[PDB]
Symmetry: C3
Subunit: 281 residues, 3 copies
Amino acid sequence: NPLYQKHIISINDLSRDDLNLVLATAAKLKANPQPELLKHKVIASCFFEASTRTRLSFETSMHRLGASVVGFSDETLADTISVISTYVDAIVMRHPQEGAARLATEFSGNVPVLNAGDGSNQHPTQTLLDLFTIQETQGRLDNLHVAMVGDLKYPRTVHSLTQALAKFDGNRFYFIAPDALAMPQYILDMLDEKGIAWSLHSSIEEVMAEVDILYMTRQFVLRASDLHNAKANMKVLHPLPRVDEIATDVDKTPHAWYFQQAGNGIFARQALLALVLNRDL
Amino acid sequence: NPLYQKHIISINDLSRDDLNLVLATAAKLKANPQPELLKHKVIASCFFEASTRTRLSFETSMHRLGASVVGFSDETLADTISVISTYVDAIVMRHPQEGAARLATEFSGNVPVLNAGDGSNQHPTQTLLDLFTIQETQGRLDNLHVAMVGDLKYPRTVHSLTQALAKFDGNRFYFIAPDALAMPQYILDMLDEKGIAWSLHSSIEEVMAEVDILYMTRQFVLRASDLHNAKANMKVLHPLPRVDEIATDVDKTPHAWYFQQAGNGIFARQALLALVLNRDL
Amino acid sequence: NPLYQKHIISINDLSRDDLNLVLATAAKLKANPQPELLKHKVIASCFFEASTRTRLSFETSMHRLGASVVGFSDETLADTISVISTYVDAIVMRHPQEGAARLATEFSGNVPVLNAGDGSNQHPTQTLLDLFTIQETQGRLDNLHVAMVGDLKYPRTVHSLTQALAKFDGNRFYFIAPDALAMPQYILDMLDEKGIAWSLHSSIEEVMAEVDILYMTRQFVLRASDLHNAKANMKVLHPLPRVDEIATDVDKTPHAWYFQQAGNGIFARQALLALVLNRDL
């Protein structure tokens, strides 16, 4: 385990075999729970910025491993972290300002900080549950067709997911975005200087028949109507919440997988906690 | 156990032997606690509408059975329930809108929802602790005199309690209410088409000497002064909170039982949880 | 154990050997944790007045002893305590009004109340962690030089700490305060009618070379610059939060001990809980 007592601010600061080990740990915890693994551990859920579904999933992941939780669903932040790091074995925090988790690392001492949302920048466990659901549904993170639909400019979870998928071989991307919203040039360059296929589009039915994963973000409104030529294995993903970015008539379909996607966050965060605060596996 | 993995929205959707089994389970848990019964269970306390005494009693009931709690004391509600039902083993929820728990049932999947307050309509565990305290104080839920004083029009817990008491034999009711407030006609008809005694009144001392239970609701202000001709077994009940509906000079008396009544909610909710998420007893 | 099932409103209602037993229990729990000591115990963290660092430390102390926590980080208070005392084994409460904990004692029955902040008056566990850190750093609570700098008029934790230190022998105090702020006359009289040394001052470097403990409160701004003639064992203490009462350039120094001080609150509150809800040690 390379992650024992590691801070986790950015998923991009991670190797591909690190991702594979995290996903394997998550699958092992999904198969047979280990509810006393993190017994006698006390973790802080410090949601400076409220996020009740992220917080509920994180705390349920902690409780599945028999840990205890203290925190707040809400002086400098430096002093707050300096004090809290003397109570707990780990700090899980969400903060409305960018770089706040990396700042917390400098005063947390021998206590690892896990980023649950750092401004609207890093949110690694969301990308981890995304990758875990992709691997869980397709059995592989290699040789896959990944359509990404919506606002691909601002939500950096999309960029983190693309960078994680590029660390595996054989994938082809499809970017559906108006124009003002579009995958920034640096990820296109990251795929070019790594030799990976990708193509912009205007609508979803343009390549509906070819996609393995359809990842949507928060005009381009999806409907079950538009899933006639879908591959049987195809899965629809959404980090949530949704309104009518995905109309409710898609929930009934076999491709609707955003609720199972959100449920897999339990195992992503469970595996991350287990890797950080435990050596043996 | 007929209640294993059952939703509990309304107490009226329950047989009399169901009530007897719940009360027996509550008495058994009151006698010798079983603190590992619901070990490895994770329950959501989703108080969309704040209710800290109901929530504290519910969560203490969960912790008495060794369970773990995640939630919020506070996108559609449908998506919220759809996501949360993938984290937890049961959902205990209070919501300010009527029918919200029944709505949550349609997306909770294999996860039972327990209504902790659904608008100002159903609140089954309050009626359950009421019945449990009546059975605990009088040793029987049959052949009893039940005075019900105050606003008997709007709080539907009164109607649920009357319907539950009518499922047992031999009771006589006394309804003390101004005029604009009065037990709605449908419960009077429920008692008529079941042959049960009941009588309206204007004051409490009119039949103070005859009552076994004096249940008060939220001009008709009670005082210890008015308890001279009380039966020795008589018990005063109030779902709480009170102000001077019950003056403080009654707290000292042996008939004051609303605090023990509220304390019995621990065992009512403990028994309900044990019945839902466990088969063997 | 004289404290079994005792209310703890004021630290001044305590003997010196009581303090020594509490500190010994805290050191024993710091040495080898006893995480199942208060198993099957349920405690209420009733923070009527929000105090997230006091609350987080209290709840972490509860969880270190394997207890479970219910409460609120926020009808009369009398009825609230009367109801809550039927759920839980102990009540830890902070309330914005003076004497609220002593009031809660009158309705808590066989449930001990532990004061986590009673108005801006009593806050015994803060004084307990102060004494524990002094004993931990100097190895003794006797024959020590204690400088107390800042507003020594209003924060009654300073008065409680001075009264606790006066219950031991051989200490000399130094009071640094503007003029409008100054240690009230009654503590000066408490030291006079007990024969203990103390001296007022105008600045810190006046007796910087002689002090064992430098306790600061919430013009008199400290800097690392002013620690050249410090004793090697000297420790800087602050109940927190701080702004520039202690400039950040002191954090690096070996005398900075306010974060370790706050961390010792875990063990102070752990020991208090263990003493109250347990007989054997």
